[PDB]
Amino acid sequence: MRVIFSEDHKLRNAKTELYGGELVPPFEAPFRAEWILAAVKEAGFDDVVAPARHGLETVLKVHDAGYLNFLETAWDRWKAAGYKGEAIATSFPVRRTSPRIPTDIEGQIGYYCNAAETAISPGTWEAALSSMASAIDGADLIAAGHKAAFSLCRPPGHAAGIDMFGGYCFINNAAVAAQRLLDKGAKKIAILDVDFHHGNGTQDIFYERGDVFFASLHGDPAEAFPHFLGYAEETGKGAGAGTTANYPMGRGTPYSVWGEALTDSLKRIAAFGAEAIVVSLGVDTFEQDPISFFKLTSPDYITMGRTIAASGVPLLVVMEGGYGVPEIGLNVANVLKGVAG
Amino acid sequence: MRVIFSEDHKLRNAKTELYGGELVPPFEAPFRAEWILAAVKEAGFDDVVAPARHGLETVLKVHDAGYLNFLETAWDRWKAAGYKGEAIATSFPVRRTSPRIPTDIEGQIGYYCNAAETAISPGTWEAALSSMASAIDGADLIAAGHKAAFSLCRPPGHAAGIDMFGGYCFINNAAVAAQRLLDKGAKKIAILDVDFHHGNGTQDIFYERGDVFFASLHGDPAEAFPHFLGYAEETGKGAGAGTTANYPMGRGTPYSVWGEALTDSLKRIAAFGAEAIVVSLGVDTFEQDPISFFKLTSPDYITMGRTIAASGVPLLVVMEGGYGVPEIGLNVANVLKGVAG
Ligand SMILES: CC(=O)NCCCCNCCCN
Ligand SMILES: CC(=O)NCCCCNCCCN
Ligand SMILES: [K+]
Ligand SMILES: [K+]
Ligand code: NA
Ligand code: NA
Ligand SMILES: [Zn+2]
Ligand SMILES: [Zn+2]
């Protein structure tokens, strides 16, 4: 399968992440794409192409225009405000707060943010557009008739909502891909999120959209980021009722339990009538991933890919989470190998 | 007037504060109480006394018990979780999020927090309880017949809402004092927040209570912390409709303009029929304050104190903001001087 990848992902290289009460090197670092690209390549997927340039038309159908405008100039305004560190939100619109949007950069960053563990830095906006472009190019391949394609997106996007960034995400690549397929002729598209963390961002974008189905398997929000979304009870709202399916699971979950959730999610996706599935692939469910508590092994990733591919509909894999361990590449390569059959 | 003060305020000595994308020494540090206490004694207010022992009965009538329970063991759990730095929230329940409460320490801290700039540290809970004791003791002085008294609270409390901490606040001292006065036999009490920042926590606590009136003068939330509450349109709700009065003002506001808002706010308080007024005094409105944009001069605090005492009802002054310059003590003392007459 073709691999879409942009070298400009490296433009995203913030030096700080708020974690455990300290500012440390980001977990979502550039080396991630390097090892993944290397592993999938030696796995046989070496047909790598750079993404083409794309306007904001597609992304403007899933993200708030004010949010996008904010991101594009955030760093400039933050630096111009006299701040020494990187752009990190401190005040947030939580319970019982006014819905008004602030004017100052310090207020707007909080308004447009769901998590302070993600800082905006020079290049974030340009890197984010390159990652979005990889997703759009992968979608076009599927629309062109390709059975499978892999967009090595970075930074990831599943935690980015309609009008908020966080979880190392700014532009929801999987959401753009999905919208792009609809724009190309599809009437129903599904997004399957196997990243360890819930795709709060993606859920938000399609919560009231009936033409898109969202299924996510993730660590139980009651005890894993993002914490405030991902509960089984959330199934959609209004025009999008019944199009959201969450499968929260607890610590130590083995593939034997995870796989069952996967099987059920694919059953709901089949019933929905998805013409294609955008897969938000996160290999952070690995038993050896530092910030996660699932116990899947490398071989399970081959099963995962094979199973999703058995849906019989075209597949677009979009890269998301997966950290630390040098096996992130192997695990991503295994999913693709599983899809190839 | 008598001065209620506690040495256990020192137990709150956080080492980090997320400001400008960096972890720097907290603006709200112990030296603040030292400078203020010395200045009030200097001005003749040397009758300082330590607060008596008080239970949680009063505070339980204004704060959520789940929230209070959370604060008492937040630092312990945080450390047991293996985190190096101090307890700082990263994930927050923002727009379109679930109302569910997480079970993990990392999730609960975000759930019970409105601003990431405030960190929980060893001794914060005990420090917060002493500051609340001083407020209660001050309240009883007013209930006993005193025309005025000063509760030198630290940490501050006006940013602490019903079930959330932030803005250097954990327990709403002014709210507890107001509640205490009502428990002593009062039917209608008012809180006047002159601190530079909006009293978002105080507003939240009494938003739906008709027995308490809340008036606040503060930097326009569109460009001043907390950024998500403090607009003139917020006048109350349900059982407490019409009991909230916000006066947001722009950058560089001098006493010439600020004075008019004070006058109107006192007029509404009188029309409400307040039997006593708790005054949340923050001197961060000073032209030299490092994090505020108002332009009050030190003499203006004398005029302010006098104008408020001219209300003709008992006054309980509760310390809040005021940072950087040592003049904070002079400004606070000038208010007590204006009030004393
Ligand atoms: C795209 C993505 O997978 N992002 C991960 C979200 C960051 C989780 N925050 C770290 C806190 C752990 N204690
Ligand atoms: C009780 C009180 O006075 N709290 C003040 C809270 C300060 C907000 N953080 C500073 C934001 C400017 N960058
Ligand atoms: K997921
Ligand atoms: K105020
Ligand atoms: Na939907
Ligand atoms: Na009220
Ligand atoms: Zn993840
Ligand atoms: Zn203040």
Side-chain angles (χ1 to χ4, degrees):
Chain A
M1 62 170 89
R2 188 157 298 149
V3 173
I4 316 302
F5 174 68
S6 175
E7 291 270 59
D8 282 339
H9 76 79
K10 66 171 54 57
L11 283 173
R12 166 61 183 171
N13 193 37
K15 50 190 173 60
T16 69
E17 192 189 309
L18 176 56
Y19 170 63
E22 311 186 307
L23 292 179
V24 304
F27 282 94
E28 201 291 281
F31 76 93
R32 294 178 62 253
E34 201 195 324
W35 309 143
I36 295 174
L37 181 67
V40 295
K41 192 169 296 183
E42 65 135 338
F45 310 105
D46 52 303
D47 178 19
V48 188
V49 305
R53 43 267 314 296
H54 294 291
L56 298 187
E57 264 188 38
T58 314
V59 69
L60 278 168
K61 295 175 172 110
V62 299
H63 282 292
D64 175 71
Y67 170 55
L68 299 182
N69 179 54
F70 156 79
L71 289 174
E72 182 180 42
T73 67
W75 176 258
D76 278 326
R77 294 176 57 204
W78 177 266
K79 188 166 168 288
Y83 292 117
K84 308 180 191 178
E86 302 180 308
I88 306 174
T90 39
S91 196
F92 300 75
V94 287
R95 288 187 296 285
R96 303 179 294 282
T97 55
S98 162
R100 283 181 184 289
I101 311 180
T103 52
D104 173 58
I105 180 61
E106 177 183 291
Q108 266 180 44
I109 188 168
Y111 180 84
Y112 290 114
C113 192
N114 62 37
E117 42 66 89
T118 300
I120 290 177
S121 60
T124 294
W125 177 241
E126 309 98 88
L129 293 168
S130 70
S131 182
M132 166 191 87
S134 294
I136 296 180
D137 254 44
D140 291 343
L141 295 182
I142 298 311
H146 284 239
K147 311 185 304 178
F150 172 52
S151 300
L152 209 184
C153 296
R154 179 191 182 282
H158 82 159
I162 297 166
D163 52 13
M164 47 194 139
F165 79 89
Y168 322 149
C169 315
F170 311 88
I171 287 183
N172 200 311
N173 309 304
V176 176
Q179 184 62 51
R180 181 67 166 197
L181 288 167
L182 294 173
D183 288 20
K184 290 291 184 169
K187 300 281 175 282
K188 286 180 144 59
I189 289 300
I191 293 178
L192 178 57
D193 195 317
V194 308
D195 176 295
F196 172 78
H197 301 112
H198 170 244
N200 55 315
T202 311
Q203 178 170 305
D204 194 53
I205 293 171
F206 301 105
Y207 214 55
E208 290 180 59
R209 288 279 297 277
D211 49 346
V212 176
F213 190 94
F214 178 65
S216 171
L217 282 64
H218 44 277
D220 176 15
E223 53 193 300
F225 191 90
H227 298 301
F228 312 103
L229 206 63
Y231 290 105
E233 67 191 339
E234 295 142 40
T235 56
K237 185 176 83 67
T243 56
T244 290
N246 291 310
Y247 303 76
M249 292 170 261
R251 327 185 78 87
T253 297
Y255 194 71
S256 68
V257 180
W258 200 89
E260 298 179 308
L262 181 73
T263 307
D264 186 63
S265 77
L266 285 160
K267 184 174 76 75
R268 297 180 135 294
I269 291 175
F272 177 68
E275 292 171 55
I277 300 170
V278 173
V279 180
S280 272
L281 173 51
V283 293
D284 45 348
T285 53
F286 187 41
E287 64 174 350
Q288 290 152 56
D289 183 284
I291 60 172
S292 303
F293 54 56
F294 275 178
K295 281 198 296 95
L296 282 66
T297 71
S298 292
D300 293 316
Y301 289 106
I302 297 180
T303 295
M304 186 192 295
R306 189 88 224 80
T307 306
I308 304 169
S311 60
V313 298
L315 291 177
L316 170 67
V317 191
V318 173
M319 197 57 231
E320 301 279 8
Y323 318 91
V325 292
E327 289 87 351
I328 51 177
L330 171 64
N331 295 331
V332 172
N334 279 353
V335 179
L336 304 188
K337 182 182 292 63
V339 177
Chain B
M1 66 188 78
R2 188 156 303 161
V3 173
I4 315 296
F5 173 63
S6 174
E7 294 293 358
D8 285 322
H9 78 78
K10 71 160 203 307
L11 296 176
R12 170 66 187 166
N13 189 18
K15 293 181 286 178
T16 64
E17 179 179 319
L18 180 66
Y19 178 91
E22 298 182 325
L23 293 181
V24 303
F27 281 104
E28 209 296 280
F31 71 83
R32 293 181 65 254
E34 289 156 30
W35 291 354
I36 294 175
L37 179 64
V40 303
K41 290 187 180 181
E42 170 91 1
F45 300 110
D46 43 51
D47 174 25
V48 183
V49 295
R53 180 54 192 285
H54 294 292
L56 303 185
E57 268 188 40
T58 317
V59 73
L60 278 168
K61 301 170 187 173
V62 284
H63 280 298
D64 172 82
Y67 168 60
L68 296 180
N69 176 57
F70 163 74
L71 290 184
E72 176 177 46
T73 52
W75 173 258
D76 288 324
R77 296 174 59 200
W78 178 261
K79 188 184 173 186
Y83 297 123
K84 312 180 190 306
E86 303 177 303
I88 295 173
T90 48
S91 187
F92 303 81
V94 285
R95 294 186 292 282
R96 298 180 299 289
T97 56
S98 164
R100 284 181 178 281
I101 306 180
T103 62
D104 179 63
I105 172 62
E106 214 179 5
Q108 299 208 325
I109 190 165
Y111 179 84
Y112 288 115
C113 178
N114 60 40
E117 31 77 287
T118 296
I120 286 171
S121 61
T124 292
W125 173 251
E126 300 88 303
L129 285 173
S130 71
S131 187
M132 165 193 83
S134 300
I136 292 170
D137 245 57
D140 295 337
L141 282 177
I142 299 301
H146 289 217
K147 308 157 180 292
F150 174 51
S151 285
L152 212 195
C153 292
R154 169 168 196 287
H158 80 157
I162 299 182
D163 44 27
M164 50 195 108
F165 74 93
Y168 316 160
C169 309
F170 308 92
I171 292 175
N172 203 305
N173 306 301
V176 169
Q179 185 55 46
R180 180 68 165 195
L181 291 166
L182 289 165
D183 294 345
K184 290 297 182 173
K187 294 292 168 290
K188 284 167 164 294
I189 291 296
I191 297 174
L192 179 59
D193 192 311
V194 297
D195 168 290
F196 167 79
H197 297 96
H198 173 240
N200 60 315
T202 309
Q203 179 170 304
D204 184 55
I205 289 167
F206 300 101
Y207 213 50
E208 292 185 62
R209 289 185 46 175
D211 60 329
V212 169
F213 194 91
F214 176 70
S216 166
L217 281 58
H218 54 273
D220 168 42
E223 57 208 17
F225 179 97
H227 299 294
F228 307 104
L229 204 61
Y231 290 103
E233 72 192 334
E234 301 153 32
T235 54
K237 176 184 176 187
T243 61
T244 293
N246 287 316
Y247 299 77
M249 286 162 280
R251 319 187 77 118
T253 297
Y255 195 76
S256 291
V257 185
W258 202 91
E260 202 190 314
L262 180 71
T263 285
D264 193 60
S265 70
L266 290 174
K267 178 189 172 178
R268 283 170 147 289
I269 293 175
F272 171 67
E275 294 169 66
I277 301 169
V278 176
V279 179
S280 287
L281 175 64
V283 285
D284 27 16
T285 54
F286 190 40
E287 65 189 0
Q288 290 182 63
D289 186 280
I291 64 181
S292 311
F293 54 58
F294 278 169
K295 304 273 202 170
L296 263 52
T297 66
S298 292
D300 286 321
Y301 292 101
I302 293 181
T303 301
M304 178 199 300
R306 174 142 54 67
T307 298
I308 298 177
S311 61
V313 300
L315 303 176
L316 176 62
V317 182
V318 175
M319 196 63 236
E320 298 287 357
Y323 311 97
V325 295
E327 288 81 284
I328 56 172
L330 169 64
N331 300 327
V332 162
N334 275 350
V335 174
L336 303 189
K337 196 177 298 179
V339 174

